Design an enzyme around this catalytic site. Structure first.
Site, mmCIF file in Angstrom:
data_model
loop_
_atom_site.group_PDB
_atom_site.id
_atom_site.type_symbol
_atom_site.label_atom_id
_atom_site.label_comp_id
_atom_site.label_asym_id
_atom_site.label_seq_id
_atom_site.Cartn_x
_atom_site.Cartn_y
_atom_site.Cartn_z
ATOM 1 N NE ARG A 94 -3.625 -2.249 2.704
ATOM 2 C CZ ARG A 94 -3.265 -3.363 3.336
ATOM 3 N NH1 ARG A 94 -2.047 -3.487 3.849
ATOM 4 N NH2 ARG A 94 -4.127 -4.363 3.455
ATOM 5 C CG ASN A 127 -4.931 1.110 0.329
ATOM 6 O OD1 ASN A 127 -5.455 0.157 -0.250
ATOM 7 N ND2 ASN A 127 -5.143 1.372 1.612
ATOM 8 C CG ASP A 155 -7.188 -4.044 8.322
ATOM 9 O OD1 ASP A 155 -6.989 -4.789 7.339
ATOM 10 O OD2 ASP A 155 -6.712 -2.894 8.408
ATOM 11 N NE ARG A 158 -9.220 -8.362 4.627
ATOM 12 C CZ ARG A 158 -8.464 -7.570 3.872
ATOM 13 N NH1 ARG A 158 -7.563 -6.773 4.430
ATOM 14 N NH2 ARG A 158 -8.618 -7.570 2.554
ATOM 15 C CG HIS A 183 -5.859 -0.469 5.802
ATOM 16 N ND1 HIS A 183 -6.302 -1.717 6.179
ATOM 17 C CD2 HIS A 183 -6.051 -0.389 4.463
ATOM 18 C CE1 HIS A 183 -6.747 -2.365 5.116
ATOM 19 N NE2 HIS A 183 -6.606 -1.581 4.063
HETATM 20 N N1 LIG Z 1 -9.200 0.564 2.795
HETATM 21 C C1 LIG Z 1 -9.331 -0.680 2.313
HETATM 22 O O1 LIG Z 1 -9.688 -1.509 3.133
HETATM 23 C C2 LIG Z 1 -9.052 -0.955 0.852
HETATM 24 C C3 LIG Z 1 -8.544 -0.010 -0.028
HETATM 25 N N2 LIG Z 1 -8.301 -0.277 -1.316
HETATM 26 C C4 LIG Z 1 -7.767 0.824 -2.138
HETATM 27 O O2 LIG Z 1 -8.806 1.463 -2.884
HETATM 28 C C5 LIG Z 1 -8.228 2.120 -4.015
HETATM 29 C C6 LIG Z 1 -9.059 1.857 -5.261
HETATM 30 O O3 LIG Z 1 -9.360 0.467 -5.367
HETATM 31 P P1 LIG Z 1 -10.072 -0.087 -6.699
HETATM 32 O O4 LIG Z 1 -11.441 0.540 -6.835
HETATM 33 O O5 LIG Z 1 -9.929 -1.591 -6.716
HETATM 34 O O6 LIG Z 1 -9.119 0.521 -7.844
HETATM 35 P P2 LIG Z 1 -9.376 1.028 -9.350
HETATM 36 O O7 LIG Z 1 -8.037 1.254 -10.010
HETATM 37 O O8 LIG Z 1 -10.390 0.112 -9.993
HETATM 38 O O9 LIG Z 1 -10.089 2.457 -9.139
HETATM 39 C C7 LIG Z 1 -9.364 3.647 -8.836
HETATM 40 C C8 LIG Z 1 -10.070 4.810 -9.524
HETATM 41 O O10 LIG Z 1 -9.539 6.078 -9.118
HETATM 42 C C9 LIG Z 1 -9.529 6.931 -10.268
HETATM 43 N N3 LIG Z 1 -8.594 8.078 -10.139
HETATM 44 C C10 LIG Z 1 -7.258 8.082 -10.318
HETATM 45 N N4 LIG Z 1 -6.755 9.332 -10.123
HETATM 46 C C11 LIG Z 1 -7.784 10.145 -9.819
HETATM 47 C C12 LIG Z 1 -7.968 11.577 -9.497
HETATM 48 N N5 LIG Z 1 -6.919 12.430 -9.454
HETATM 49 N N6 LIG Z 1 -9.223 12.010 -9.243
HETATM 50 C C13 LIG Z 1 -10.289 11.191 -9.274
HETATM 51 N N7 LIG Z 1 -10.188 9.882 -9.561
HETATM 52 C C14 LIG Z 1 -8.992 9.313 -9.841
HETATM 53 C C15 LIG Z 1 -9.209 6.014 -11.436
HETATM 54 O O11 LIG Z 1 -9.684 6.553 -12.674
HETATM 55 C C16 LIG Z 1 -9.919 4.733 -11.039
HETATM 56 O O12 LIG Z 1 -11.214 4.637 -11.642
HETATM 57 C C17 LIG Z 1 -6.808 1.586 -4.153
HETATM 58 O O13 LIG Z 1 -5.880 2.614 -3.795
HETATM 59 C C18 LIG Z 1 -6.722 0.433 -3.176
HETATM 60 O O14 LIG Z 1 -5.419 0.284 -2.604
HETATM 61 C C19 LIG Z 1 -8.555 -1.486 -1.830
HETATM 62 C C20 LIG Z 1 -9.052 -2.520 -1.055
HETATM 63 C C21 LIG Z 1 -9.354 -2.339 0.352
#
Ligand SMILES: NC(=O)C1=CN([C@@H]2O[C@H](COP(=O)(O)OP(=O)(O)OC[C@H]3O[C@@H](n4cnc5c(N)ncnc54)[C@H](O)[C@@H]3O)[C@@H](O)[C@H]2O)C=CC1
Ligand SMILES: NC(=O)C1=CN([C@@H]2O[C@H](COP(=O)(O)OP(=O)(O)OC[C@H]3O[C@@H](n4cnc5c(N)ncnc54)[C@H](O)[C@@H]3O)[C@@H](O)[C@H]2O)C=CC1
Lengths: 331, 331
Positions: A94, A127, A155, A158, A183
């Site tokens: 992350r 993240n 977390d 889980r 996290h």
């Molecule tokens: N807190 C948690 O428990 C978890 C967090 N995550 C995090 O969530 C984040 C996204 O996960 P996913 O949806 O699977 O990824 P993804 O890559 O499918 O979606 C990310 C989105 O953010 C957009 N984006 C990028 N730069 C941007 C900006 N400047 N302004 C607005 N939008 C922008 C992209 O176009 C993309 O659609 C990741 O950073 C991942 O590490 C993922 C799983 C669990």
């Protein structure tokens, strides 16, 4: 009537999150107006999202706006789910996203301060979310630390399911499991407080499960879980954090239940009883009163083992902050 | 206590469907036990699914079983969501999946008859779902036509939102929109029955919207919608049909609301008032009583335009049946 923002809406999490909220799971009987923010190269999936939202005929969805313009996204919003992020490359953790996501949340903090309601509740998911939450909160002049929090409930959920399976009881029958700090790799899945009740009788988890499992096997398992999903899924989690994020926000909006303790990443409050130093966003055991204010739950014990783990993840958080903010300064 | 089956669980729809059901949106206060079926090459994502279900700590999820074994999946189930399918290639329509999916639902019908409860409610989602539902129902010796239905509510929800936007009212304010026949290219988005009420006053849709829009622009738009999502998403819909499928099943389980009419693909009942011939699964305007029995809603008018459209999609359904069943015979 309630305006909900979701940045990175076109992504995997934003896809499910938008639909689930529109279903009425967040605000219940009250309608929701979705602000959907993303970037032009994702304009296709962003439109694809809205079309499917339309195709659900959600009676709880008053309307929506899908944009790339900050103002249209942040104007007079009641709460925000910050999911925006660049791709996490294979083999990365992350914290490796700091270089590519720091500016995003620097700008986001400014947008929030400029256009969002003063009462806006910002939940950071993207993240590194503890750090990204620190970035946004720092660069939001007109907002306060209480407006920001990061997601750690995935977390906890889980941890809850894992412990439940080993005790031979349901999740609802377990209490006071906590995930402290970041996290991240250094997350502290704490069971020293935990108890569970079965047929009238309450037991402490540490008095039932062997030491080696609690402090090594279990501790490792929860930290590594995110990468275990990645191994099998081919992508990091999506449905499960969406659930945690809606659960998190709902508790933040309308308060928690009796005895309910939720792991919530919040700006370290001055005078917290667990010796954590201010300057970062740190996952604490929290509850929320009926007026929507988070409070760190007092009374939990910190033995030598937990103290060391807390110091490690605290040090980790301050380190991520150093790297992140320095990147912004040079940026 | 309620055992719910989902075939093709590891896929895109099965992913969201499983989580949403586990959240308690289908059976409410009653717990759910998920039977998750898929094939060995998808064993990875199947495990990835269960792990995320575990990571939600759903209190409404009593348990689950993820398998490739038919018996373990179908044993004593109360209802089933048939989502299993091979990939739809670029440029193809739903009917192009007949060759690769026919055997799947031939076997599924046998599994259902052999292991599922006699009261099992089978909802077919995998395309061609009207046909696939005909396959399964035919090859289920111990079950009856009333145990089977196919999903057309995504088409209705598409129609409802579209019409709502043009009338300047909410979806809930519109009534008696119907999608007849096949969930395919020949689908009949009918507005000749439709009405809407605003501030005490009810109006017929055809008396408010111009002819050219109703019978050409609108008719085309709803049929082409699935491919419009595909253009923007890069894959066919997933979240929206999941919603329609849960909506469909819930209505099938506990009955519909006053005045509520749902487009439901059902085995053509002998003596239906709309002149459709038995032998296929056909989308009718339906309601469901409080004991869970579907009934075709009587009273709707069939003018020359609708009659021709119904004949076309009916002919289309009997054609798909010919191709599908012949493929099985040679297979
Ligand atoms: N807190 C948690 O428990 C978890 C967090 N995550 C995090 O969530 C984040 C996204 O996960 P996913 O949806 O699977 O990824 P993804 O890559 O499918 O979606 C990310 C989105 O953010 C957009 N984006 C990028 N730069 C941007 C900006 N400047 N302004 C607005 N939008 C922008 C992209 O176009 C993309 O659609 C990741 O950073 C991942 O590490 C993922 C799983 C669990
Ligand atoms: N009724 C509707 O309104 C809609 C229907 N669909 C249909 O739903 C189906 C699946 O959609 P997605 O989830 O996006 O596709 P997907 O390809 O992601 O999932 C299909 C799953 O079925 C599994 N499968 C294949 N053969 C099987 C067998 N013999 N037994 C058990 N499982 C098997 C695959 O392993 C795969 O995981 C498609 O046929 C699609 O046309 C899609 C959108 C809307």
């Amino acid at each position: 009537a309630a305006h909900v923002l979701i940045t990175g809406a076109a992504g995997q999490i934003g896809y499910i999150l938008s639909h689930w909220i529109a279903s009425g799971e967040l605000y219940g009987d009250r309608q929701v107006y979705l602000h959907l923010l993303d970037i032009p190269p994702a304009m296709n999936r962003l439109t694809a999202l809205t079309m499917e939202l339309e195709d659900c005929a959600f009676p709880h969805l008053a309307g929506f706006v899908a944009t790339t313009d900050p103002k249209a996204a942040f104007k007079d919003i009641d709460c925000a789910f910050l999911v925006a992020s660049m791709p996490l490359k294979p083999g990365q953790v992350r914290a490796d996203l700091i270089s590519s996501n720091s500016v995003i949340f620097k700008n986001t903090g400014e947008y929030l301060s400029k256009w969002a309601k003063p009462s806006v509740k910002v939940l950071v998911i993207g993240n590194p979310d503890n750090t990204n939450c620190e970035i946004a909160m720092l660069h939001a002049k007109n907002l306060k630390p209480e407006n920001f929090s990061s997601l750690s409930m995935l977390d906890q959920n889980r941890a809850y399911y894992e412990v439940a399976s080993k005790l031979g009881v349901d999740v609802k029958d377990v209490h006071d499991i906590i995930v402290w700090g970041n996290h991240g790799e250094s997350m502290v899945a704490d069971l020293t407080q935990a108890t569970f009740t079965k047929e009238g009788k309450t037991q402490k988890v540490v008095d039932v499960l062997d030491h080696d499992y609690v402090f090594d096997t279990f501790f490792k398992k929860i930290g590594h879980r995110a990468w275990d999903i990645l191994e099998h899924r081919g992508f990091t989690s999506a449905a499960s954090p969406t659930k945690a994020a809606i659960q998190h926000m709902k508790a933040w909006l309308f308060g928690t239940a009796p005895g309910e303790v939720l792991s919530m990443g919040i700006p370290v409050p001055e005078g917290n009883p667990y010796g954590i130093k201010p300057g970062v966003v740190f996952s604490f055991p929290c509850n929320v009163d009926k007026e929507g204010k988070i409070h760190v739950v007092e009374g939990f014990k910190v033995n030598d083992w937990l103290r060391e783990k807390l110091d490690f993840t605290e040090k980790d958080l301050f380190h991520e902050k150093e790297i992140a903010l320095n990147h912004l300064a040079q940026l």
